[PDB]
Symmetry: C3
Subunit: 411 residues, 3 copies
Amino acid sequence: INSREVLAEKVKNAVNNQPVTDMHTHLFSPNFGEILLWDIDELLTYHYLVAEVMRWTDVSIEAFWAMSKREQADLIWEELFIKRSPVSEACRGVLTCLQGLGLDPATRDLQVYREYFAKKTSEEQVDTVLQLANVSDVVMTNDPFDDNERISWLEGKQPDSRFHAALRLDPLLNEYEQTKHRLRDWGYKVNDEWNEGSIQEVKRFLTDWIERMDPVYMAVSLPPTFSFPEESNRGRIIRDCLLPVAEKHNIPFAMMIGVKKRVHPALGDAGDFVGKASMDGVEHLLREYPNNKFLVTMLSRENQHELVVLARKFSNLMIFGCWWFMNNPEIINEMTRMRMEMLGTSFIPQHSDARVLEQLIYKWHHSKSIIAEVLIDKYDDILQAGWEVTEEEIKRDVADLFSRNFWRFVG
Amino acid sequence: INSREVLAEKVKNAVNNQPVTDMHTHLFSPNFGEILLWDIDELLTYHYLVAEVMRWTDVSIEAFWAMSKREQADLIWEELFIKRSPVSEACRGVLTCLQGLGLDPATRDLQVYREYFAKKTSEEQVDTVLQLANVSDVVMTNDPFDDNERISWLEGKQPDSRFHAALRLDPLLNEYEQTKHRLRDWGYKVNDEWNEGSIQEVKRFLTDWIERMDPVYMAVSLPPTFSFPEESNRGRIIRDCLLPVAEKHNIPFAMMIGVKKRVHPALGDAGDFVGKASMDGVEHLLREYPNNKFLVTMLSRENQHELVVLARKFSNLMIFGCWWFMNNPEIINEMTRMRMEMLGTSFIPQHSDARVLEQLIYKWHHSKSIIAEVLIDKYDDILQAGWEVTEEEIKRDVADLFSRNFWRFVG
Amino acid sequence: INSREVLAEKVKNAVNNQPVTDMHTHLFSPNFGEILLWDIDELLTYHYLVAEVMRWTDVSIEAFWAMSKREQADLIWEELFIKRSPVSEACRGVLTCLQGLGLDPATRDLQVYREYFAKKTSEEQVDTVLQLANVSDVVMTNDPFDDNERISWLEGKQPDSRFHAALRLDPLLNEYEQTKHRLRDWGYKVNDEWNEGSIQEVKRFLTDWIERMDPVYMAVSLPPTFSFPEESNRGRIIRDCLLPVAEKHNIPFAMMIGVKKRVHPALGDAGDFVGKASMDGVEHLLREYPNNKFLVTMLSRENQHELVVLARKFSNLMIFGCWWFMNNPEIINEMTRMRMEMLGTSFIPQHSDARVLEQLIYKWHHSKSIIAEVLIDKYDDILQAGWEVTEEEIKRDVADLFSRNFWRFVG
Ligand SMILES: O=CC(=O)[C@@H](O)[C@H](O)[C@H](O)C(=O)O
Ligand SMILES: O=CC(=O)[C@@H](O)[C@H](O)[C@H](O)C(=O)O
Ligand SMILES: O=CC(=O)[C@@H](O)[C@H](O)[C@H](O)C(=O)O
Ligand SMILES: [Cl-]
Ligand SMILES: [Zn+2]
Ligand SMILES: [Zn+2]
Ligand SMILES: [Zn+2]
Ligand SMILES: [Zn+2]
């Protein structure tokens, strides 16, 4: 390669053809049941769009939740696509999905699009989507406190080889005072106070599930006020239970910091907000637990640059994705550029956070084009400096970014 | 449209031809008197340039204020345009105004530029400028605590139909301790305590001025430390008087948060600074007062992204403009993109904040070019996804952004 | 200048031809000895690359520090250049230096690059590098608390006309409890108690060193928690000694704010982190000490915009460079644009912070190209407004930005 033009095609092709390992989604293996969502109506009722439609429609939130799935979908399509152009990232995403499946957004024929999905099955749509989105591996969010999901694990169900488990623990860490009673009901003899017994039982709880799911990592989403150390249930659990168990099983600990839950409870999953967090807690964890691995992603735009700098300090920290409110072109671009400039290729640029199966298509299509453009710029800079990049080196670097860095980290 | 080039021309045409409603300025109906500032000398002595010239000139701030308007204008012209290239946004803006008026910056003939304004009346210039800037409606900042402005309203003088009033309340909310003495002198018997009597009289004051002004909204500028609820005069006035009255008359409450007043007293209007604010008070107001409408713009760059996320949570929140220190190309661009990507077209991209008539020319010229660029990108992305946008839908979306969204919100 | 194409040509040439005054580096006049670091092995072992290589290599940090300079350099070359493409800014910089020296990165022949340096003397390489990077003046960081540097000064060493001293005081201001003992060891009779006697001896220490080094400014790097006034050694020493001495000798005070030292002790120089600081202390200093001059650069991305706004308020504030974690293309670009949009040309866009002689080549090459682009955009915008910029004015502006603004400020 010795031309930006030539470089551009080589990079775009390597990126496009590179099978993706999506290390954080809200999808489930087909055999887990209806817990796996898919089709155009599910795409249109994605909570991102529920929030956006409420800024326009005169239909009360109560009434909205009272409508059927199809009715909610019809309202959103009309309000966000017909009455106004679907220029938002979330709306754009729905279109990218339709087009990717072979459907044509030009006609705006929602009924015809729907007819497409009605024909196929879950296992069938999964194969097609994973093919079209070029995703080889999907990491789920497995929460044992969720009855709809725990039932499948207790039944001995196993996800197919393309889906990996990740032990989600928000209820345990953030709501211990209520959750402790559920552990007791499950036979985990935790006591009123934090003593040897409570510690051991919570650890047994973690180990039992690690044994059941064989998770690639344990995870938790945290508030902007997250601090560590801390004399709170969360602080003690992390210190006395999670970290020791994680080290023993060499399992990474994923922290998604910055979410302020339910600032608008009526909106349900669309009612969460964001706040800038202190880096002190993460800094402490990284330094004081050198034998533990940490995967981190933050919600606030204002935490992104310093998070990158922290990654420069600690190799036991792997930063990943452009999470939630960060998953917009303007932010993805600035984040990926800051990350590559200070970390080279030693990071995971993105995850889809897909809640609806088809999203894998747009999530990866929208991000890959931006990442490819960033790569082209960086490769070109060193080419201009006289360096010679081979297509094989490109495919290698791209492989690390979209798949290898993750598996290498989880080990 | 089926090509970026084609799209670009149709988008730019739609943006340029769309009549603008400037929902926040410091301009006054021409019949109000000299408070309506205009001409090249007023543009050159805009406080933005006073701050900039003071970074170069050897002239003391005292000596500067002692100079006549023409002398100050002369100094600023020589210091910021001749001794160094006028590359700053504020300086660039002055040139943009001259050009729009038919004058030629190439000559740098300040004397000739001045001759242009001397042969014109204020009403004439108003028609000229509003025409050039394609501004159909101007929202003023009317402060009933200023003796001069108070005259116009008490005399029953109505403003030009193109100008709308906005009840500014900074003295009341931020300086109650000193303002209460004037409220009493005006017939509003507020006590030195916050009893029912005082509460009722403040409401009466607001109610009376809403009747006299028929404002599109009530407004206040707040410091980075703004909090709510709060046991202070401002906190009690907002809770017990402003919100109740605003809800009863269904008029929005505009909050411009982030200004740290007079960090450099000697600079006058040019001595204000900025600070990041907590989103807690705004979040509280939105959630706890669903029957009230809120217009918000923040001064800190670091508050922009989270403000957008907050708008996603509450439909009774309408964010607007790129205020003051945010009114620069680099910031206008990132802000507008973040806003459209997460809010689609459900927001008001800009306002001029013009203190001098002519500024409407450059403020909107400089902002429309950027907004057009963003729209082109967003339209092209969905266009690439197979969606087809009609030129009529473009005019519709452009109308919402530059005018409809505001009037719709103020109801 | 007719077209943007013609404009770009004249701007690029002026920027490239303009001799640079690098107002902050960690280089020393060659006659000072081996403390002046140079050659490819030094470039490769720059702490920026030590941090980066530790994110990839299996070699422990202890084993790394135990390796020879050559072995460390071989490791870094293989890990960051061969096993992965050298796309990070720091790695790209190493290549740019190689190319600028006439070597060829295409061969990846590290053994051959090393031969180029095995010949030359320090004096020759200084002449070579300064000519290539077109740097006419280099400001050093002279720390009288470092035993080695101190001996040179006490024994009469003077830098040649191309190098200027800057009195660095971190140990005095940030570690006074440890430093007071050393002051006493040097004849400065400070008491354990902070009183008039101690104040006078610290003032005498500063005076003696100002006289010995004839520094262009006194400097210190500060933590994100920096505040002023403050009841602490730093607060008292700045108030009682530094500011009065600086005013008396009319010497500016350079504050580099935002570094959190040694968050990862084992990484040595590569173990410092970043944090956002309050602007309160800087605002206070500028306002209350109008007779003192302050040079400021901040480490947090989130402090940049407000720092610019503060410069608009105070002429005794000169902001400079894109420091450390800010010295990446994505950040340099946004910072430089915000600065010019709000300050025109009244600022110092960059400094190299070079710790290794050859870095001057890449630091200035990478920054000049970015600064050139910003200038082209800004000049083009006013050209489109009708203004006509001459090539002489362009050369003047470029001279101000890269050299004149500094000498003028510290004059
Ligand atoms: O992308 C937005 C989401 O998926 C959130 O609703 C979700 O709660 C978040 O990503 C999480 O994993 O906690
Ligand atoms: O945009 C700069 C301005 O107009 C400020 O001086 C003004 O005080 C501010 O916009 C306000 O309305 O409080
Ligand atoms: O640019 C990175 C550096 O030179 C730092 O190591 C250095 O300590 C910093 O610039 C300073 O002068 O304190
Ligand atoms: Cl911030
Ligand atoms: Zn998620
Ligand atoms: Zn205003
Ligand atoms: Zn940007
Ligand atoms: Zn330095």
